[PDB]
Amino acid sequence: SILDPEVLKVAEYVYQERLSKPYTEVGPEWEYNHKTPYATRATGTGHNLQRFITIDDQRLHRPIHGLAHTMRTLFYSQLMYEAAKRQPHPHRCADGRTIADLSVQDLKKLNIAQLFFVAGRESEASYGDAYHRYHLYGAKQFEAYARKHLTHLFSEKEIVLYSRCIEDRIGDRFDETAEGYLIHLSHMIDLMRCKSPVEVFIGHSRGVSGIVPTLIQLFGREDGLDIMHYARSLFAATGEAVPYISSSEWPHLGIESDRVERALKIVGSLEVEGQEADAKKTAQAGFSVDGCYGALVKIDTPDWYHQVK
Amino acid sequence: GAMGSILDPEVLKVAEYVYQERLSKPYTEVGPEWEYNHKTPYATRATGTGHNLQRFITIDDQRLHRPIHGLAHTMRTLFYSQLMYEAAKRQPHPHRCADGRTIADLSVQDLKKLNIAQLFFVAGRESEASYGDAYHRYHLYGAKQFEAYARKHLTHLFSEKEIVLYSRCIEDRIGDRFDETAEGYLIHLSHMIDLMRCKSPVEVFIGHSRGVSGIVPTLIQLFGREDGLDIMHYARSLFAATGEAVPYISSSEWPHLGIESDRVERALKIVGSLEVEGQEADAKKTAQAGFSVDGCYGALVKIDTPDWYHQV
Amino acid sequence: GSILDPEVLKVAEYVYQERLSKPYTEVGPEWEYNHKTPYATRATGTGHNLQRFITIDDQRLHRPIHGLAHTMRTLFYSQLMYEAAKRQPHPHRCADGRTIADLSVQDLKKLNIAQLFFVAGRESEASYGDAYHRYHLYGAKQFEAYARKHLTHLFSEKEIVLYSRCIEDRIGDRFDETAEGYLIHLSHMIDLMRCKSPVEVFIGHSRGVSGIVPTLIQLFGREDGLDIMHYARSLFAATGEAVPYISSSEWPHLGIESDRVERALKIVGSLEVEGQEADAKKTAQAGFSVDGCYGALVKIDTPDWYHQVKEK
């Protein structure tokens, strides 16, 4: 519910230098046509999607991956820190540790690293090769900023760790590291703003579990759905459309009755109505750190959440 | 403020053993052959009162044996030692024990070994009897149960000299002091703290006699008034999390307890005034904390600590 | 042939390695019971030392009465009784309002899993009250902990609580408190034919109680009922156990009223099957591995009317 003021200083720099900047890998050089897949600089779709919106003749660049998206993930990691500490058997990562092993100081550093997580993006390109390049860019920006301003806070091995977290390196598991796990999970929660019911509730494949089943399996239905409703309220606080949910429709989405019944068993019946986007709240979230943070601190957190610092 | 999962899988595996092998079983020194009267001291095989107190309680048709010295009581003491491990690090000159060490000299490994030992501390009980001879028999039973388990399953973690030392902590032989070793000191303190669930205001705040300090005053003089009081409130909150009655506190009532103005006044400048309301017992939470390690642990990891537990 | 879900067999493997293959621990001299000296040992009843293990080809097979072969047989019984309830106009209505036919093919899998744990908490063959309820509460909590960590993707939390309470068989829950518990209890009851007398199997103890197969007749009729009876007897045989002879002729000579043996021959009809005696290596192969136990049981033909649903 609260963020350290030094986290917000780094937030201000990241907004000015990156999250407010236009996408550059845009335009005709970066259109994609799958039958001539190498005719351009793009080798997959998405470079020209929602490059910006205009709110009251101000231009808001990278609206899907801007200040508000980035700051919401920092509230997600602070909440899931407490949720993980309420579990008897928090998930153990490939490094031997759980989210409950992170200190209150570790979560400050992790918040700083989340500021850079998508800061290296140059379009909304989605395909694998663009994704790993943009994350490399974010990781390099993080290393540079931290090694110059944040050595009083980050040791050298922590800079390497959190940069490897931002990089999302080829061959690292989702849960390679407790730090990187909490970071991927915070990013995952925010995908609810724009993914289909199938991705949010059923999992896009037979193996995959889906965003909300993942929260329920990690924190139980009670805490997990608390978190899902809290993120949905963070959407609204920052003007984004809040999708409706209807577990009635899931049997009609094209998925084998197999995966649907499993998804309804995990999640339970859910019928909650949507909300519409709001241009003014969008603009206050997107254009200033003070604007975004002030809209986010005033949203109530779950009853069980008692933030430490 | 949740403390979170602080005990590693190895410690929980031991806790499952201690529950399955000892803390879940009926007390056995309990029938007519263990009643007692000081006026026919050796009519039965008991030599003091208490063998038939609180053998079990029934909660929603489930029978919970040894509710006073069961799983919930044992687990809570592991949480107190973790909290007091941090508190001793906020202290200039923590107490130096007969081994020449303090609580602040404990490593994270020592705390893990100590937690394992605490799992057995009262696991050798065969009744609620706490008169001299039954007390020392039951703690020696606990020590031997710990030695048997450790020598078969924990030799990659306890050296042979460590199994002897921790066994000695559990035994609590006559002649042994509170503070022979830093580890045992901490074990005794965690046990002491849980006594607030069932002891009178005089033992908790003023002291049994003119000599002994009493439970909360002992916390206060080891950790300061502020850390001390936080530990007290934390323990009280753990009673509620495992469904146990939490006694009220009324520092106003202490002159009206029939003990000298001498002793009562000193207890109110150490502790300061205190008015905290009690809370009844809860049977659902009591059963959930009593019949499984998962239920008891899951209930306890949730509970807030003071913020200073988290800062290092 | 009848089939089990691969995820049920995976849990069946876990339950063999972790419980069903482990020796009983409430055994030996400290659990022997002598009725003349009721307070001599830890036991408050008889049976702790009955049939701790048998020896096949100098291999020691622990808990042979309540091991892998009994447990897996009960899973096959509930599968068959599910379809058998599916064939009845007004199948029995349990205290929760549901019948066995109200369960889905997916519920049966969850029930199958819960059945694996039904006697897995036993620490001896003791069956007197206090021992029976401790053992079923052990098995219930061992189901809980396993489900809550490896099965949240298949069990809801309400479902875990429900199936745990079925395994627990709490005091004051009726045989038919839930449709789930009813099916679980009925499957255990079928397997008691392997070891109990003609009076329990056909006439009952008292004036109020039905026999084991008068019960299967009253629920599924006479053809469906005794079809189930013979399928069980045939699962005994495939798992090496002695198949007692049946003789309706002897039933008067049993020292119980013509009242009851009258009812039995009306309900069951006349019936006389010759017995068959046990087989060590069919007992050993059904006792020592999931693969050996499953492989033996899938090869027994099901009755004509049984068409099992499972494909996913």
Residue numbers in the entry:
A (entry chain A): 3 to 311
B (entry chain C): -1 to 310
C (entry chain B): 2 to 313
Give the text the authors published on this PDB structure.
The overall structure of DupA resembled the PDE domains of the SidE family ligases SdeA (Kalayil et al., 2018) and SidE (Wang et al., 2018) as well as the PDE domain of DupB (Akturk et al., 2018). The three catalytic residues from SdeA and DupB PDE domains were also highly conserved in the core of DupA (H67, E126, and H189), while several loop regions differed. Varying the length of the corresponding SdeA loop, deleting the loop regions from both SdeA and DupA PDE domains, or swapping the loop region did not affect the function of either PDE domains. In contrast, mutation of the three conserved catalytic residues from both DupA and DupB resulted in impaired cleavage activity. Moreover, after 5 min of reaction, we detected a labile and heat-sensitive His-Ub intermediate on the DupA His-189-Asn mutant, while wild-type (WT) DupA displayed heat-stable auto-PR ubiquitination , which was further cleaved by DupA at later time points. This suggests that, similar to the SdeA PDE domain, DupA utilizes a histidine-based intermediate reaction to catalyze the hydrolysis of ADPR-Ub (Kalayil et al., 2018). Thus, the PDE domains of SidEs and DupA/B may share the same catalytic residues to mediate opposite reactions: PR-Ub transfer to substrates and removal of PR-Ub from substrates (deubiquitination), respectively.
